[PDB]
């Protein structure tokens, strides 16, 4: 149904406010906020959101506390001031997906339309993208397990339309723009290996742990496609790609001729002014 979503940083800075208005009490649980957006178009666009007092139990996980009057009053007044945005779903700040999320999401599945779920981290130490759109749809399983709520990962992007780019750029004054060239390219080409190294290294360790020490079926069926796609590149002998290395290396030669020739053109004004300025300033100094 929905291919991609658009999440503005305003809601995540509202999660910064979720971490600001705590009051130093010692709970810091998965505070659930009422996510708002535009479900009209096929693409989802989050503009702003708000929160609702949400408290769980220490031992029992099935305890969840929501509010209907606060949702209808905040949504009623928010719709009165801005009717272009309506309820879409919710989101929790907890890093782990608990079992009670089917009951928490089930309320906004009954009263509200199909709600999207977003899992983020309480500490911004994760290098990866903090936002993951999880659609709440029921899927048929091939093994015969009963139909239940399944959270499929929907791709997400963090973009601002008109003003939040200006506000973020003015508040930071440290981040740089695209700036195609040497630095913005070589930084990605340096740290990219760590950007994949922390993800893969962080995932395959617990993966290999759950291979031998795993039960409660983790959908082992998708592991066959995992190792299949991993074995779709069986160390090609590079025999056919030699001519492609001749093409890319020939373009490399083109960049060699462009650099040497163009820089040789740049040497004109320098290697002329260095003489005509020094000898004339010297002969005319005294």
């Amino acid at each position: 149904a929905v291919q991609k979503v658009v999440v503005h940083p305003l809601v995540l800075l509202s999660v910064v406010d979720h971490f600001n208005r705590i009051g130093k009490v010692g709970n810091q649980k998965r505070v659930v906020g009422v996510l708002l957006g535009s479900w009209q178009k096929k693409v989802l666009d989050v503009s702003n959101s708000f929160a609702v007092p949400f408290d769980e139990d220490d031992k029992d996980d099935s305890v969840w506390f929501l509010d209907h009057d606060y949702l209808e009053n905040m949504y009623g007044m928010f719709k009165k001031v801005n009717a272009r945005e309506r309820i879409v779903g919710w989101y929790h700040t907890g890093p782990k997906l608990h079992k009670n999320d089917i009951a928490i999401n089930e309320l906004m599945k009954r009263y509200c339309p199909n709600s999207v779920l977003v899992i983020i981290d309480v500490k911004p130490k994760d290098l990866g993208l903090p936002t993951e759109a999880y659609i709440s749809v029921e899927e048929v399983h091939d093994d015969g397990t009963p139909t239940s709520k399944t959270f499929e990962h929907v791709t997400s992007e963090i973009g601002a339309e008109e003003a939040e780019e200006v506000g973020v750029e003015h508040l930071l004054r440290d981040i740089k723009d695209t700036t195609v060239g040497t630095l913005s390219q070589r930084i990605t080409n340096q740290v990219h290996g760590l950007k994949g190294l922390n993800s893969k290294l962080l995932d395959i360790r617990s993966y290999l742990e759950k291979v031998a020490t795993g039960k409660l079926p983790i959908n082992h069926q998708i592991i066959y496609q995992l190792q299949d796609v991993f074995n779709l590149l069986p160390d090609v002998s590079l025999q056919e790609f030699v001519k492609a290395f001749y093409l890319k290396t020939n373009d490399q030669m083109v960049v060699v001729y462009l650099a040497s020739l163009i820089r040789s053109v740049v040497a004109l004004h320098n290697l002329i002014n260095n003489k005509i300025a020094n000898r004339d300033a010297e002969k005319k100094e005294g």
Partner: protein, 189 residues
Amino acid sequence: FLDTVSTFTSYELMDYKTFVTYTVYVSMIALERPDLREKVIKGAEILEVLHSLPAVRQYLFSLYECRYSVFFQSLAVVEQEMKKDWLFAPHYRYYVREMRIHAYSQLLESYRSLTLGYMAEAFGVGVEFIDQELSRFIAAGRLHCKIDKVNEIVETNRPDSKNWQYQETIKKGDLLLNRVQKLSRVINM
């Protein structure tokens, strides 16, 4: 000589028929097939002046037609007529060799491999002479790649387009490298 439309009989320096007879060498040899088809074959001037002497028409239609059996039999008139001239004699050695290598590049252009039978019958000469001909035109002529006689068949490869088309600038890269080394010699002195 493209302005031959406005030219006329000039008894002061050279007659018109002598001007055509003198420009038929630089035009017939110094031009390739597209240059002839564009300039002279499309033009009506040579179509007008070919009726004066029937030999020129033979040296144009036979060369453009790639018939060496009659071009070599009639080439002796170009050899004898080429010399004994005021300004055209001392260059008689260049037109012969340049025309022979130009015809060999013409026939060898559209032909990759060539047996000695069709070549000997086409040119009408013994194999013992074309042996030293191509042997001297591999290094001396420098027209195409190395030739082999493992099967007694003229077989060339000519990889002069794909990689050599990009390698035509390496000479200017090395000469430009020596020229920027001279630029380094200008530094401080």
